Amino acid sequence: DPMKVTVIGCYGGFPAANEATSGYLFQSGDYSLLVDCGSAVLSKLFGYVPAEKLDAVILSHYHHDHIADIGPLQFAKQVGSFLGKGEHTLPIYGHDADIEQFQKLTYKTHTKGIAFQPDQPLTAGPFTITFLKTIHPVTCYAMRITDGSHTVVYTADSSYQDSFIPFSENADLLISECNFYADQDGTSAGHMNSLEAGRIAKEAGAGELLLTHLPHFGVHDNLRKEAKTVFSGEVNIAKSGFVWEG
Amino acid sequence: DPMKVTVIGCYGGFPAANEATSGYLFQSGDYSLLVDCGSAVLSKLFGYVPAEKLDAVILSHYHHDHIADIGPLQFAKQVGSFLGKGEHTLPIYGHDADIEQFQKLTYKTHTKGIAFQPDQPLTAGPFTITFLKTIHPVTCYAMRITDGSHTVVYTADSSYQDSFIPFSENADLLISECNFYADQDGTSAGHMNSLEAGRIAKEAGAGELLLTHLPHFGVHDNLRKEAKTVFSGEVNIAKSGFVWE
Numbered sequence: 137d138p139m140k141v142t143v144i145g146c147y148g149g150f151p152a153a154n155e156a157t158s159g160y161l162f163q164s165g166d167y168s169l170l171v172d173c174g175s176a177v178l179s180k181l182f183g184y185v186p187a188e189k190l191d192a193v194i195l196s197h198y199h200h201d202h203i204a205d206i207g208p209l210q211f212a213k214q215v216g217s218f219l220g221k222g223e224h225t226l227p228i229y230g231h232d233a234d235i236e237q238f239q240k241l242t243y244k245t246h247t248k249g250i251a252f253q254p255d256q257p258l259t260a261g262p263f264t265i266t267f268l269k270t271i272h273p274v275t276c277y278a279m280r281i282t283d284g285s286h287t288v289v290y291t292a293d294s295s296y297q298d299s300f301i302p303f304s305e306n307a308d309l310l311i312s313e314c315n316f317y318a319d320q321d322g323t324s325a326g327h328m329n330s331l332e333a334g335r336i337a338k339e340a341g342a343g344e345l346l347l348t349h350l351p352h353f354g355v356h357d358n359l360r361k362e363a364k365t366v367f368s369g370e371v372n373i374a375k376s377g378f379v380w381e382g
Numbered sequence: 383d384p385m386k387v388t389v390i391g392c393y394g395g396f397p398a399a400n401e402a403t404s405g406y407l408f409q410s411g412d413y414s415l416l417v418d419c420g421s422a423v424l425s426k427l428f429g430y431v432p433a434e435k436l437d438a439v440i441l442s443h444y445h446h447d448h449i450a451d452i453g454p455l456q457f458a459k460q461v462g463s464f465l466g467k468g469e470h471t472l473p474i475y476g477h478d479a480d481i482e483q484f485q486k487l488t489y490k491t492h493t494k495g496i497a498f499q500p501d502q503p504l505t506a507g508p509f510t511i512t513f514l515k516t517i518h519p520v521t522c523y524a525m526r527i528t529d530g531s532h533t534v535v536y537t538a539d540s541s542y543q544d545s546f547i548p549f550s551e552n553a554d555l556l557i558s559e560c561n562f563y564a565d566q567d568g569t570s571a572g573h574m575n576s577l578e579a580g581r582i583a584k585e586a587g588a589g590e591l592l593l594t595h596l597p598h599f600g601v602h603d604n605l606r607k608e609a610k611t612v613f614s615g616e617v618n619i620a621k622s623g624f625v626w627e
């Protein structure tokens with residue numbers, strides 16, 4: 137069983153015309169895990185896997201562009217249930233330090249909020265997930281996701297920190313946010329530029345780098361060239377439908 | 383300047399694959415009004431009009447499938463500000479009887495919540511909008527929207543009530559939720575079926591009928607056919623991209 141990541145949405149903040157914000161489909165065997173659930177994510181996701189075949193959701197943080205589709209997903213589960221597309225409760229994992237956001241993850245018997253613990257690995261079917269707190273204006277967690285043979289790291293949202301490097305060590309794929317260009321500083325917004333994403337990939341010895349949480353200006357391909365001045369492996373710009381597999 | 387309605391999203395509850403939930407673009411001359419702002423609505427919207435050219439938003443009620451994209455919208459306004467695209471604050475109209483939901487409409491200087499009053503007509507640019515409380519499990523309002531020449535009525539979400547008829551009287555286009563088929567009762571969930579949508583069009587003497595808030599089962603074309611056994615004017619199933627003018 138190979139591990140397969142499909143980018144569902146990849147824009148920062150809000151979606152470009154016909155595109156989506158943060159959502160990533162992680163699949164192994166029959167298991168389907170959705171990582172983040174932003175704007176237009178469900179619409180796109182259902183082109184790949186129907187609501188009832190989704191096994192779990194995990195959320196890095198509670199910014200609109202990572203959670204806007206949660207309530208629609210809750211409605212999908214409720215209707216699925218009244219349609220007899222199987223009555224199974226959908227677990228949604230998040231941090232519980234923000235009480236009100238976490239409470240909203242639970243909807244009748246249809247979805248169920250489950251607190252992940254930052255200092256302890258989570259098992260979600262065939263996946264193990266470990267966490268790193270990021271530098272972002274709200275509590276937020278990057279994720280090291282493995283199936284035992286391959287490892288994919290998702291930075292979620294963050295400004296640069298050296299701790300990404302031991303955390304991303306030997307990842308087959310690093311999905312790094314890259315909201316800014318080489319000549320810009322994303323510190324005040326809690327974001328990274330392409331040189332920073334390139335630095336993490338190189339220093340961790342990542343096999344491959346995918347740049348995501350994309351900006352709404354500039355030439356995105358410039359983000360690729362800029363990262364490539366630092367990191368020598370494969371680099372790509374995320375888009376809806378982009379697939380990685382190992 | 384013709385009045386133009388473009389369906390942005392039209393599924394009930396949650397989007398079908400590559401589609402969207404309640405959203406409708408209302409245009410008149412230079413002005414663009416977004417009626418409801420559900421799931422994948424922004425993504426589709428920006429295909430017709432960019433965030434800075436949006437003049438106002440109005441929300442029928444606070445169910446996920448009508449408001450999910452509000453937060454992303456507020457972020458689009460914010461980033462627009464930083465890019466020099468629009469310093470202009472986007473008004474979002476809604477009822478304020480649900481206090482916490484209403485408070486979420488205002489975001490810094492980027493969007494501004496403005497309370498519409500059910501019993502008083504609202505003037506939004508070239509449009510005048512009047513309201514009818516509907517029968518739904520949360521507070522919700524249908525909308526008669528006119529530019530002085532043409533009138534479009536939007537039922538929003540509701541089970542059947544007679545008051546829709548005088549409310550929809552002589553509408554040029556009636557946009558009616560139609561979450562159920564002829565042989566089903568939508569009362570318990572606050573929704574209507576195809577015969578009820580048809581009944582309103584017929585008795586209000588609506589010029590044309592558009593069925594929306596669509597279900598995720600059955601053959602949608604049957605909604606059209608069933609409605610056509612009561613109403614004799616034109617009847618269509620909503621889809622993203624459908625244009626009435």
Ligand SMILES: [Zn+2]
Nearest residue numbers: 149199201293
């Ligand atoms: Zn984000």
Ligand SMILES: [Zn+2]
Nearest residue numbers: 197199272293
């Ligand atoms: Zn964020």
Ligand SMILES: [Zn+2]
Nearest residue numbers: 443445518539
């Ligand atoms: Zn509703």
Ligand SMILES: [Zn+2]
Nearest residue numbers: 395445447539
């Ligand atoms: Zn609805």
